[PDB]
Amino acid sequence: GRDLIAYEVKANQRNIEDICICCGSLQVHTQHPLFEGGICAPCKDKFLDALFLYDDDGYQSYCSICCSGETLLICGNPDCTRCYCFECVDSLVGPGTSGKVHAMSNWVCYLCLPSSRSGLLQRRRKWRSQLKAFYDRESENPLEMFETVPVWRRQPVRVLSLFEDIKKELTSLGFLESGSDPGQLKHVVDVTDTVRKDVEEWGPFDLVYGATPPLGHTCDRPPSWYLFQFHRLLQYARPKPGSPGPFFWMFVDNLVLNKEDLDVASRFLEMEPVTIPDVHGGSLQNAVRVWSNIPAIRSRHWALVSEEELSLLAQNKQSSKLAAKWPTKLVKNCFLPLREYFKYFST
Amino acid sequence: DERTRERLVYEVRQKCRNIEDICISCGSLNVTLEHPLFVGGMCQNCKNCFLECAYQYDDDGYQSYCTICCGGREVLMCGNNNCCRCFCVECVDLLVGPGAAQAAIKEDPWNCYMCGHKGTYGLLRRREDWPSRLQMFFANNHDQEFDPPKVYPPVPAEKRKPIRVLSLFDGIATGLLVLKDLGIQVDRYIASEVCEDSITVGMVRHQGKIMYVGDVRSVTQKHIQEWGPFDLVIGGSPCNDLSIVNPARKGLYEGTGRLFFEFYRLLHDARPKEGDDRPFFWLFENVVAMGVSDKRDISRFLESNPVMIDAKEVSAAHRARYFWGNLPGMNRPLASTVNDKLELQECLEHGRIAKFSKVRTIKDQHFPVFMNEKEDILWCTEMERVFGFPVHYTDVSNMSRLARQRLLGRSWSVPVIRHLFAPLKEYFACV
Amino acid sequence: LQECLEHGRIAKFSKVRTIQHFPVFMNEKEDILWCTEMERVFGFPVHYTDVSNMSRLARQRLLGRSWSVPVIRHLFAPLKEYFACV
Numbered sequence: 001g002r003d004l005i006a007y008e009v010k011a012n013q014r015n016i017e018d019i020c021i022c023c024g025s026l027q028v029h030t031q032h033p034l035f036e037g038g039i040c041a042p043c044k045d046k047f048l049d050a051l052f053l054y055d056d057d058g059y060q061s062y063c064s065i066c067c068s069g070e071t072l073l074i075c076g077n078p079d080c081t082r083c084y085c086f087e088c089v090d091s092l093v094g095p096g097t098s099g100k101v102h103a104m105s106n107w108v109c110y111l112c113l114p115s116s117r118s119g120l121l122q123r124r125r126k127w128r129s130q131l132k133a134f135y136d137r138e139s140e141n142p143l144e145m146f147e148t149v150p151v152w153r154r155q156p157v158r159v160l161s162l163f164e165d166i167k168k169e170l171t172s173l174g175f176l177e178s179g180s181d182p183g184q185l186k187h188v189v190d191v192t193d194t195v196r197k198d199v200e201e202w203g204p205f206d207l208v209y210g211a212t213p214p215l216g217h218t219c220d221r222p223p224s225w226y227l228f229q230f231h232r233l234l235q236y237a238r239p240k241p242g243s244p245g246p247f248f249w250m251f252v253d254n255l256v257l258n259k260e261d262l263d264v265a266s267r268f269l270e271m272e273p274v275t276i277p278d279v280h281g282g283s284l285q286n287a288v289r290v291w292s293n294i295p296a297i298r299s300r301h302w303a304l305v306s307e308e309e310l311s312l313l314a315q316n317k318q319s320s321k322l323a324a325k326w327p328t329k330l331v332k333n334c335f336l337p338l339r340e341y342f343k344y345f346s347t
Numbered sequence: 348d349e350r351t352r353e354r355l356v357y358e359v360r361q362k363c364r365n366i367e368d369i370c371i372s373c374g375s376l377n378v379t380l381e382h383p384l385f386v387g388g389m390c391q392n393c394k395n396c397f398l399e400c401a402y403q404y405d406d407d408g409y410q411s412y413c414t415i416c417c418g419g420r421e422v423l424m425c426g427n428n429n430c431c432r433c434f435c436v437e438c439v440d441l442l443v444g445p446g447a448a449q450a451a452i453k454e455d456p457w458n459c460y461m462c463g464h465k466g467t468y469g470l471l472r473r474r475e476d477w478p479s480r481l482q483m484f485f486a487n488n489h490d491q492e493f494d495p496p497k498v499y500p501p502v503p504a505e506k507r508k509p510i511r512v513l514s515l516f517d518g519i520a521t522g523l524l525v526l527k528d529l530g531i532q533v534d535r536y537i538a539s540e541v542c543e544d545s546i547t548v549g550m551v552r553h554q555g556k557i558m559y560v561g562d563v564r565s566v567t568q569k570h571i572q573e574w575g576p577f578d579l580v581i582g583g584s585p586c587n588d589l590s591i592v593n594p595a596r597k598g599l600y601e602g603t604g605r606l607f608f609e610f611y612r613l614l615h616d617a618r619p620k621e622g623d624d625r626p627f628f629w630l631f632e633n634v635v636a637m638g639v640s641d642k643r644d645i646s647r648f649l650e651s652n653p654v655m656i657d658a659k660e661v662s663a664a665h666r667a668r669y670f671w672g673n674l675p676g677m678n679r680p681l682a683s684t685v686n687d688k689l690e691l692q693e694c695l696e697h698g699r700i701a702k703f704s705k706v707r708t709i710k711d712q713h714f715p716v717f718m719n720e721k722e723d724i725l726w727c728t729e730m731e732r733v734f735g736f737p738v739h740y741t742d743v744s745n746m747s748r749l750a751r752q753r754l755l756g757r758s759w760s761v762p763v764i765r766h767l768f769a770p771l772k773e774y775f776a777c778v
Numbered sequence: 779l780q781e782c783l784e785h786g787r788i789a790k791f792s793k794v795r796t797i798q799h800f801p802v803f804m805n806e807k808e809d810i811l812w813c814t815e816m817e818r819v820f821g822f823p824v825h826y827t828d829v830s831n832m833s834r835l836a837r838q839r840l841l842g843r844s845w846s847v848p849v850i851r852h853l854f855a856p857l858k859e860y861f862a863c864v
């Protein structure tokens with residue numbers, strides 16, 4: 001009972017930490033990370049699932065308190081993706097608050113600025129850290145996971161991108177500057193002579209990217225060679241030990257290296273490939289295999305797409321007379337979580 | 348108008364505007380006051396926000412909002428010991444610079460600017476007599492202008508009689524206890540209370556000396572008349588819901604506000620008529636973290652200007668409370684006797700050392716005592732010692748620690764109430 | 779027992795026996811001896827056990843195990859004949 005809590009805390013003088021704010025359950029597995037209160041075990045699982053899930057346009061996919069995508073309230077800060085739901089704002093803040101908020105249309109959310117008086121819902125201090133610690137202790141098999149950066153503490157992101165230029169993509173993701181002559185991305189085609197001294201001369205980097213080519217071969221050098229060159233220059237672009245700043249890396253395959261070379265690659269990048277298809281009408285138009293540390297890269301995986309169907313796709317797309325196009329839209333949305341880590345700006 | 352606000356700040360730093368001519372809290376031009384702590388003007392809306400928010404504190408123990416604008420976005424908590432102040436990012440973007448907040452966060456031993464050892468900074472400088480101006484800032488609340496309370500001439504010492512107190516919202520009988528500490532003869536002490544444990548505390552500690560009643564609301568004017576003329580009516584509204592400390596704040600003046608008006612009604616019922624010049628006195632108490640319009644309605648109904656009194660001046664707690672009343676010398680400055688403990692460490696038990704010098708009652712700082720390399724609560728007898736109660740005051744009945752602590756917390760600070768009730772010795776009989 | 783009670787309390791019993799569970803008729807209601815009264819029953823000084831933040835059930839249990847103070851005074855009293863005095 002979501003509505004009952006307003007009696008339970010006020011009349012029964014009960015701590016918010018003893019009840020689940022996300023649904024109204026009285027048995028809580030732990031406390032809620034972002035806001036003051038407890039959280040029960042299915043809601044905990046639901047939260048961890050939805051955690052870094054965003055939408056295609058840019059904003060967060062589910063409701064930041066309870067993870068309800070059914071109803072959404074968009075915050076009115078260009079540097080805040082946090083979207084809410086009506087049931088929470090009236091349940092936790094008081095009986096007629098979500099409609100007022102909806103009628104404002106210039107409403108900053110709780111995280112943005114809490115100076116507004118709140119009925120019951122209190123914002124936890126330090127909450128970014130609390131979120132990280134929550135994921136650490138509460139996720140089964142936790143992963144490489146970095147604390148989310150406060151918005152004023154967000155610097156522009158330093159990209160290395162090997163064998164494929166991502167300037168166009170990430171600029172369209174507002175991550176890179178259209179008005180700058182000093183480029184905030186360093187595209188390299190040929191890495192063959194490159195030394196550790198050279199990658200270090202090019203500056204430190206925040207994001208490293210590298211991808212195998214599509215089926216139309218620009219060169220005959222085998223698809224394993226790109227992977228290994230990526231691994232090397234990746235080990236070069238790693239930040240000096242002791243660095244708290246967030247470092248990421250993302251390798252992409254356009255179905256061009258076979259299972260044997262794929263097994264080798266899975267070993268060397270120390271996780272299993274994430275397949276991210278293009279399905280139109282139910283039909284598998286295209287697909288791409290990824291490795292990266294980027295948050296919620298692994299929950300985009302589609303275990304429905306079998307390896308035999310990908311072998312059939314590779315055979316059908318090799319035998320066509322069409323020139324090969326980079327599948328921009330598949331890996332485009334796989335950079336959205338870096339919004340919460342790095343400086344955005346749009347025009 | 349946000350761009351205009353920042354623009355105004357730009358014009359200030361280019362020496363085209365004075366910082367004292369702008370409201371540094373919200374950027375308004377309607378400058379009436381000066382900001383007490385720091386340099387800049389202060390509009391009246393930001394005064395009201397400053398009144399409501401400046402002494403609010405989170406469950407953390409640190410401030411609920413930013414010290415500068417009483418609002419702000421994401422605050423920056425201070426690492427200095429015993430300091431609980433918060434500076435939001437947006438203010439530090441102006442007064443220190445748009446690159447120094449980000450570099451000050453990276454500074455792990457970070458002191459706030461009220462605690463900064465240097466004291467002076469470029470756009471922000473700390474005004475010197477800020478505790479004096481903080482004290483004056485409540486005398487600055489002349490928005491509610493009233494006439495002074497009527498001063499009655501003192502009755503001769505041979506004609507004095509024992510005092511008769513109506514004490515609404517008695518709790519653990521602090522008021523009678525303080526009257527006995529002063530040595531004033533008490534003819535009768537009528538007390539209206541609902542919580543059984545507090546009734547019990549009073550019954551036992553005051554053997555054969557208190558007549559108990561039921562609900563305040565049930566008490567009629569007929570009861571007030573038939574229980575003798577009263578010489579001192581005291582009371583304090585519940586501050587469990589009225590404070591921001593309770594996580595459950597569904598209303599603000601549902602419940603507690605009603606009970607204030609009960610004090611109001613029985614104050615009129617116990618007030619002698621015009622022409623009856625007999626000495627009558629009354630005290631109301633409330634917590635500082637309250638609403639402005641709330642404070643206005645209270646000051647209007649009681650027809651008086653409140654006096655803030657903080658217990659830090661005399662005791663071992665931060666206990667800032669408003670006192671409305673006509674008791675003589677309610678304004679005069681507090682004196683702390685040698686029996687009163689101004690350090691927390693003196694209130695501790697043996698074998699216990701305190702990191703804090705004052706605790707404020709509410710991996711994080713929840714419990715204020717470092718005993719045997721371990722964080723631990725103040726013991727209940729120590730909390731008694733912190734407010735100036737007699738030792739073991741609340742150990743009457745078989746009650747839990749949590750309930751008993753809670754019981755203790757609500758109570759008035761004993762040397763403060765001794766400081767307020769002390770000139771009543773000039774008007775009533777002694778033991 | 780009535781002399782060991784607090785004020786406002788009247789005991790039906792003249793003795794309490796620890797080796798009608800709740801021995802006190804206060805305000806037409808049956809109630810346990812309070813902790814400071816159990817202390818008075820055995821002859822401890824007043825408020826002897828209120829040192830730390832312990833529960834009532836634990837503290838009663840801590841009191842009940844103890845030796846009876848005038849009994850141990852009666853026993854230890856001839857030792858004044860053998861050792862120094864203050």
Ligand SMILES: Nc1ncnc2c1ncn2[C@@H]1O[C@H](CSCC[C@H](N)C(=O)O)[C@@H](O)[C@H]1O
Nearest residue numbers: 516517518519521540541542585757758759
């Ligand atoms: N309707 C009511 N009538 C009487 N007392 C009430 C009441 N509602 C609440 N109370 C009690 O009044 C107190 C509010 S504040 C008590 C402070 C008191 N001066 C003291 O030193 O103990 C609480 O103990 C609360 O339980």
Ligand SMILES: Nc1ncnc2c1ncn2[C@@H]1O[C@H](CSCC[C@H](N)C(=O)O)[C@@H](O)[C@H]1O
Nearest residue numbers: 820822839840841842843844845846847850
């Ligand atoms: N191994 C042990 N060593 C020391 N004390 C022990 C013990 N086992 C139990 N005790 C304690 O010894 C007591 C048994 S009887 C205590 C009576 C004591 N004369 C008094 O007046 O308090 C209990 O407090 C019990 O907790």
Ligand SMILES: [Zn+2]
Nearest residue numbers: 020023040043
């Ligand atoms: Zn739940």
Ligand SMILES: [Zn+2]
Nearest residue numbers: 063066085088
């Ligand atoms: Zn929600």
Ligand SMILES: [Zn+2]
Nearest residue numbers: 075080109112
């Ligand atoms: Zn927001």
Ligand SMILES: [Zn+2]
Nearest residue numbers: 370373390393
């Ligand atoms: Zn202002």
Ligand SMILES: [Zn+2]
Nearest residue numbers: 413416419438
């Ligand atoms: Zn501020």
Ligand SMILES: [Zn+2]
Nearest residue numbers: 425430459462
């Ligand atoms: Zn400080």
